[PDB]
Design a protein around this ligand. Structure first.
Ligand SMILES: Nc1ncnc2c1ncn2[C@@H]1O[C@H](COP(=O)(O)OP(=O)(O)O)[C@@H](O)[C@H]1O
Ligand SMILES: Nc1ncnc2c1ncn2[C@@H]1O[C@H](COP(=O)(O)OP(=O)(O)O)[C@@H](O)[C@H]1O
Ligand SMILES: Nc1ncnc2c1ncn2[C@@H]1O[C@H](COP(=O)(O)OP(=O)(O)O)[C@@H](O)[C@H]1O
Ligand SMILES: C[S@](=O)(CC[C@H](N)C(=O)O)=NP(=O)(O)O
Ligand SMILES: C[S@](=O)(CC[C@H](N)C(=O)O)=NP(=O)(O)O
Ligand SMILES: C[S@](=O)(CC[C@H](N)C(=O)O)=NP(=O)(O)O
Ligand SMILES: [Mg+2]
Ligand SMILES: [Mg+2]
Ligand SMILES: [Mg+2]
Ligand SMILES: [Mg+2]
Ligand SMILES: [Mg+2]
Ligand SMILES: [Mg+2]
Ligand SMILES: [Mg+2]
Ligand SMILES: [Mg+2]
Ligand SMILES: [Mg+2]
Lengths: 440, 440, 440
């Protein structure tokens, strides 16, 4: 798809508004509309916006930013009226002088893809995204009231969101997605939708799309879709399971029928590199305070650093599917993260495993939550950052994460997350009053 | 049907989503949707799911499970829209490598069918599960409020669920059910729908279907369908009378016009066999704590172990119908049980009766509830397990049930029921506060 | 005062009930009443109780505990009726075989006092206890609603605890306290009563007596006295400043009339030891999760390890008073701490500072909250443990704190605090739903 095909699709399908979109450094999608009559000149001039009103983008005395449109991302939004049909287009962020903005999260992922190509590979991540369907209130703003008390794979009337989950599938299919499965998840009113994997760029655009498509579809039905990692205590949390495989010559490099476990050496080294660096960018994968209330044992979320086949208690699970389905599933990432930065760091953590032949230890093919602390330390197992501050500390000292993100993204990400933590740590919570007020 | 017929029916009838379904060990239906485009892939590769999130199924270190589809069990759900028509397919659970997971209740029932064939028989059970129709609250959750005060065979306006029952029959007919009759039952808001008998596999699939079809239609019509055996006190409860029969060369083996009572010797031995073993697997037919509030005298629910013709106070009634309709009605089970396990155990017990020529005693052709304890003890009549713990104890000590179920199903059924009961024996109920708390 | 004097006072002042009391490991006062008629024999037989129902005392297999009475602690409670006058007696916890149970906080403080005696010193401590006065709801339960909006030294009607503080001072004077000054504190509805210092044992007893006297007096007037460090956010917290000096031959050892700053060398060494060991037992001085929400900058609660004269932003302030009155004010602790453990650890740290001439650096006669991180790092200033887990970690690796507390107190304190933190670390607070749940 070129700029000329987008204009033809705008005329043929009667598009009136194009929503130019980009993602800010914290993974939030920023969008604004232009008339179709402007598209042409936009394509040769770029749209202009204010970078000082975007998180971690640019300062107020140098605030003008340009957005250059990517014609390949032209999609048509199906939940908006077909008369004045509304399309969307994602773009890259440029400085007004003309150079690409190094602070663009979508540029970091492109830079990582460059190194992947230099080594002759291409990441083919495809994520599992889970969300919660809560009820709205009179005004129409989010709540945490459950829409049902169902469980895993539960049928109606325990599962009350199947009519609201057909339309998500339909919208995704109209937006170029390839749905694979759709089901209720372990937590009450928690659902998960899986779509086919693809290139890292397309998959990250799909992640941000999927998120806002799901939220918009839920809103127009009376509910609210929340991709918050741990909205409820004592039940499962939402994860963003990142299954990834390297592809060379259009073949799965991670597959090897001759070796035991049908896992090639490049997959072993990729795992080794992924484990050597996960501690450093857990801040990126789990970027909010809530994402660390999900990393507690007993809810199928990782707490320690390990890897084993078929083990949904471990960090790097290897599903049983071999052949063109041989991938590694990283289970830490949360749907609240920035997919561009997260995928970039995953990509070049594996590429540090291949260039340095980083052998991981023996797999821990056992439940790790049912181990003593002595058992865990004797086996060499280490734990993930306990809270967001510990992850921030592990991230600041990193040279790998700074080299991957770059100075601007590194510094601005850290500055936002430190402010978040400083706001969090001073707060007095109702738990503290209900625990200490009467006893002291 | 076959694979190709399913695809032809998906194209011809315009099916968009296929709901792949199975049954967990405790009898709950677990389903999830895949696009029709995925169907051809799911027939050659199976659909993978998490076994660790299914009750009594598999552990979290080897949690991957495959599910292979059964083309014959392909139906089209009528209460879902006809534009994006939704079908369902039941499957058999497999270990991810190649094996037919033995913890699957469907596999247990198939194993019992194998022994039936080895003896040259085929069970033809047809059940008559009852249910209650309660009202939903403002949110739409189940309540125990009555939808009518009617009784047995009551007409309107005492019977207020004629439209609900008519639409349930309509949907069941579209799902391939041969409806026999439909009526109000003794308890208020309690209804019963009867469909033709068939092969035990088909009728177990039909039991699970019937249940979720009824529940979904009731939900969409405003009410809640409850298969709880004893939802209300003082009124009779819901049971799943299993009318069992053996067929050889397409002829009812239990029929014998020359013998008195028109019951063959094989029927006699089957009665003796499943009378000697019921105490052992009452924890399967009656699997929940509420299941034994139903087994109290005075409500046409069995309390003792006996058989007699047309006696609705006895454990094994023999209806008056002879000829092709000659069967034996085991009245103990609830609709809360797992039909795959329950029918398997009944079939195995009957076949064990036939092998060892187990003659039952004389038929107790009296109201057993009216007999005294001395009368029952002198007549040799035994009682069923009084509560869930007694049934668990009678079941774990048995070798017949362990052989029939297998180690995995046996142990994971015990464990589940023991944890269920241990959570119930420690509860302080408002009955104890209404009785005590003022006298003490 | 001895047993004979206690009996004489019981007869003379018409006492019927004696509240035998002791402090548990976590600082909570546990008491029970015995009739005066039993006193005469309790003195020679102790009073037996159940140690398994006391936090960190003993196990259920060996739960029988004895408590011996201390006649010197006999006080008469003035807020209870004078007809059947009620007295109190603090006890020492023994073991039924007969030995000074080492898990007793009183025993730990007594061991620290013995350690001091060998060096010729006697520790004098004057606590600085602040509290909040909140309203009680309809049922008489604690709330967090303010009883006034006054500030520091505010007069009525801005200060609305005139009568409450007047009667608290009266009760404390009746219980042998020498009241120094009562005033309104910085936070709204925060109050401070100061009493004269004394021997560390006597003032450790006074600390628990003060808290329960204040709580009872406030309760009888319709309020709730809260000794919670940080019950409200954005407002000063309650701290228990430990003013401490060393006396040798009835003279203040910390005073030196001919020396700059008029502080003796022993005072300098005591400061050095306190500073060098503070990080290790911050889990004792600040033992609850809420005590580290008080240790935030901008509220006159210390955040960093420093010392300077008249600096209320410093960890160790040295007030301007000299002569009899020269002390060091450790501002770290909060009222929620166990005074017996806290004073014991401070005394041991100071004595360890004196034994090895631990010179502290130059004082930081500067506001430290206003310094940058770079400035603090350049000056070598270390920060206090950021949260309860950090303090727990710093305490576990300590050999000094284990030496002072002992194996039993050490281990049981660690266990209680780790359980507390693990309960707190997994909670989802409303702050997380107000911040996220719309952003995500
Ligand atoms: N070779 C591959 N490389 C990367 N991702 C893949 C590959 N094969 C499958 N996937 C993706 O893995 C995801 C697995 O999702 P799903 O099977 O629903 O959950 P789980 O695998 O945790 O049971 C799918 O979204 C799919 O697109
Ligand atoms: N030969 C047979 N074998 C097994 N089941 C049968 C046979 N004949 C009839 N049935 C079943 O017995 C059930 C009888 O139900 P119904 O007559 O409504 O209640 P009841 O028999 O208790 O009065 C029907 O569902 C029918 O399918
Ligand atoms: N020599 C001393 N040793 C120990 N404590 C002392 C000494 N002199 C006074 N104190 C105590 O110091 C405390 C000072 O309280 P306060 O007047 O509020 O001081 P500040 O306002 O500086 O905190 C009093 O409780 C008093 O008993
Ligand atoms: C059953 S679950 O196993 C739930 C995982 C949980 N929500 C989490 O990873 O945080 N994971 P998956 O969808 O990969 O099967
Ligand atoms: C009158 S009843 O006859 C008794 C049903 C009752 N609810 C029971 O628990 O078995 N059932 P049916 O007529 O189907 O034999
Ligand atoms: C005005 S205050 O300065 C109170 C400080 C605060 N309550 C705290 O130490 O946490 N200090 P002090 O009581 O010693 O005079
Ligand atoms: Mg999934
Ligand atoms: Mg999932
Ligand atoms: Mg997964
Ligand atoms: Mg019937
Ligand atoms: Mg019936
Ligand atoms: Mg019947
Ligand atoms: Mg003061
Ligand atoms: Mg003060
Ligand atoms: Mg002070």
């Amino acid at each position: 798809t070129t700029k000329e095909d987008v204009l033809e699709a705008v005329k043929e399908r009667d598009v009136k508004f194009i929503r130019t979109q980009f993602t800010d450094t914290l993974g939030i999608i920023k969008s604004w509309a232009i008339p179709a009559e402007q598209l042409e000149e936009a394509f040769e001039n770029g749209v202009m916006f204010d970078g000082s009103s975007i998180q971690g983008f640019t300062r107020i005395e140098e605030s003008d930013m340009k957005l250059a449109l990517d014609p390949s991302t032209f999609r048509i939004l199906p939940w908006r009226p077909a008369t004045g049909a509304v399309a969307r287009i994602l773009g890259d962020v440029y400085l007004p002088d003309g150079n690409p903005f190094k602070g663009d999260p979508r540029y970091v992922l492109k830079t990582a893809i460059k190194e992947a190509e230099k080594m002759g590979f291409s990441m083919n991540v495809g994520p599992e995204l889970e969300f919660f369907l809560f009820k709205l209130d009179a005004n129409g703003n989010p709540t945490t009231e459950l829409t049902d008390q169902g469980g895993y794979f539960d049928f109606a009337p325990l599962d009350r969101a199947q009519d609201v989950r057909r339309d998500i599938d339909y919208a995704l299919e109209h937006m170029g997605f390839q749905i694979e499965a759709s089901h209720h998840e372990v937590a009450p009113s928690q659902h998960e939708i899986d779509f086919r994997f693809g290139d890292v760029l397309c998959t990250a655009d799909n992640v941000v799309t999927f998120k806002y498509v799901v939220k918009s579809i839920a809103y127009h039905k009376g509910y609210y879709a929340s991709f918050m990692p741990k909205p409820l205590f004592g039940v499962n949390g939402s994860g963003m399971h990142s299954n990834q495989s390297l592809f060379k010559d259009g073949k799965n490099v991670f597959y090897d029928p001759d070796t035991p476990t049908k896992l090639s050496q490049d997959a072993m080294y990729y795992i080794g590199g992924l484990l050597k660096h996960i501690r450093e960018f857990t801040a990126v994968t789990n970027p909010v305070v809530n994402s660390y209330k999900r990393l507690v044992p007993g809810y199928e979320a990782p707490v320690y650093i390990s890897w084993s086949a078929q083990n949904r208690s471990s960090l790097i699970r290897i599903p049983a599917t071999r052949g063109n389905g041989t991938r590694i599933e990283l289970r830490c990432p949360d749907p609240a993260c920035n997919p561009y930065l997260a995928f970039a760091l995953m990509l070049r953590a594996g590429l540090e495993g291949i260039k340095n032949k980083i052998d991981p230890g023996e797999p821990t093919n056992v439940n790790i939550f049912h181990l003593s602390d002595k058992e865990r330390e004797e086996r060499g197992i280490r734990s993930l950052p306990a809270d967001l501050k510990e992850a921030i500390d592990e991230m600041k000292g990193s040279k790998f994460v700074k080299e991957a993100l770059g100075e601007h993204v590194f510094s601005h990400y850290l500055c936002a997350k430190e402010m978040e933590w400083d706001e969090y740590k001073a707060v007095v919570h109702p738990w503290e009053l209900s625990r200490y007020l009467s006893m002291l």
